[PDB]
């Protein structure tokens, strides 16, 4: 975010972040980071979740083009420069940067693709500078009639209105999955408690139950574990690599045996399907 110079939108820059603790209050408390809007995760919760690998895609666009950076949204930058997949979880942070990328004479360091034969696939970068073909006759390396240069330079200038001011955009994409997470949110560990009804939080996986030692042999890469109902019943302790079995806390049905209240008000209680030494 404090990088002096961002890359062009057509050749957008990508950085991989993993194996560290991430605090999102650092980005949140800065005033200039105006457009901080996230799909699939509420921003306030970023302080608690745990991610496997995260990607930061950085570029610079026009002010009105920010609305085109969205899943399922069509746009010039969406069609030919940068398309967000529909099933995308993650946030976008766009903020005005007129103070850095605008020249009174004119800035020409940033370019965007204008013509392409086909729409870009999600998270696809195309750096081809070939002369776009618009007619039946081949271009043959000549940018004549019906032969156009798909790259156009953004002529940012400070005198422009807000509609054309340069905007720096960083898209954070989360690889939220069952894989062993390494991008860890700010949270403190706790000693392991076993054989009782506890509220557990394993790498952002909330639950309530009893944690017991299990004989299941997880594959060295296999992190979680499920059952026929597709719920996490076997888990792996992130701090120390052991396999724990999760059992729902003791519950059951309670019924009341009672004669008519007309004759008496004494009652008896039947706990269904449980030996009452464990009541």
């Amino acid at each position, epitope marked *: 975010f404090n990088a002096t110079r961002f890359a062009s939108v057509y050749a957008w820059n990508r950085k991989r972040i993993s194996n560290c603790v991430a605090d999102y209050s650092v980005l949140y408390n800065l005033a200039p980071f105006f457009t901080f809007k996230c799909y699939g995760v509420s921003p306030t919760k970023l302080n608690d979740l745990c991610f496997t690998n995260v990607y930061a895609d950085s570029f610079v666009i026009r002010g009105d083009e920010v609305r085109q950076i969205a899943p399922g949204q069509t746009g010039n930058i969406a069609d030919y420069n940068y398309k967000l997949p529909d099933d995308f979880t993650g946030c976008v942070i766009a903020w005005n940067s007129n103070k*850095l990328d605008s020249k009174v004479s004119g*800035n020409y360091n940033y370019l965007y693709r204008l013509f392409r034969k086909s729409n870009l696939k999600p998270f696809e970068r195309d750096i081809s500078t070939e002369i776009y073909q618009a007619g039946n006759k081949p271009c043959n390396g000549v940018a004549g009639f019906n032969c156009y240069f798909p790259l156009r330079s953004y002529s940012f200038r*400070p005198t422009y209105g807000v509609g054309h001011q340069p905007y720096r955009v960083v898209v954070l994409s989360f690889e939220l999955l069952h894989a062993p997470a390494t991008v860890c949110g700010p949270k403190k560990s706790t000693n392991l408690v076993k054989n009782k009804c506890v509220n557990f939080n394993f790498n952002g996986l909330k639950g309530t139950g009893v944690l017991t030692e299990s004989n299941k042999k997880f594959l060295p890469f296999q992190q979680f574990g499920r059952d026929i109902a597709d719920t996490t019943d076997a888990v792996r302790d992130p701090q120390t690599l052991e396999i724990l079995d999760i059992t729902p806390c003791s519950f059951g049905g309670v019924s009341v045996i009672t004669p008519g209240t007309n004759t008496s008000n004494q009652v008896a209680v039947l706990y269904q399907g449980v030996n009452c030494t464990e009541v």
Partner: antibody
Amino acid sequence: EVQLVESGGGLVQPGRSLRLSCAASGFTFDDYAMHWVRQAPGKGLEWVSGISWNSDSIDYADSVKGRFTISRDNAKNSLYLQMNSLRAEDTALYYCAKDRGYEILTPASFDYWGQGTLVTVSS
Amino acid sequence: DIQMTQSPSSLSASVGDRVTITCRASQSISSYLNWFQHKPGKAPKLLIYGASSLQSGVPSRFSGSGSGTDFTLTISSLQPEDFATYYCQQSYSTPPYTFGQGTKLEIK
């Protein structure tokens, strides 16, 4: 905390030429632009020249065009400014300003400066 | 062309006073100015850049306000280490990086 050393000043006959050198060591010099500005002994600041992070965009003051030239060596992290065709109005102080951005003509301001070197142009 | 004016030139105050200085711009230039503290004995320093964006590393006593042509700097504390001249410089107009005339500030 960045440090800016400026050297090459002294006494010179008007009409001669000389060199001013400014070296920085407190930050990454490859991605920051620099400028040369003048503080008159009895008048306020006024911009002289400036160069970007790389030698692509260059500019000069209106009364200064065609007289002084600037250079930038990123290998040893320094920049040079040549005094040419000096007269009696160039006996002021020079400051080696560091730009916030990367280009030369931007709303970006000057962040950190250092102690300048005193020059005078007289017989 | 651009012209800038500074109504105050020399002002008097004390250690525990609050003072303000203003700058005027000939034409509207979208509030893109920076404000400089120039100590006569050492290197001058940036205090605020842009309209009201405080530069990190300086006390927050100084406050900037105003957009368009008239801009105002305010000192609420006036510490005994503020014997300097204050400058307001523009970076928007076609004439690049023109500076203003000096503003002496002292306490008596």
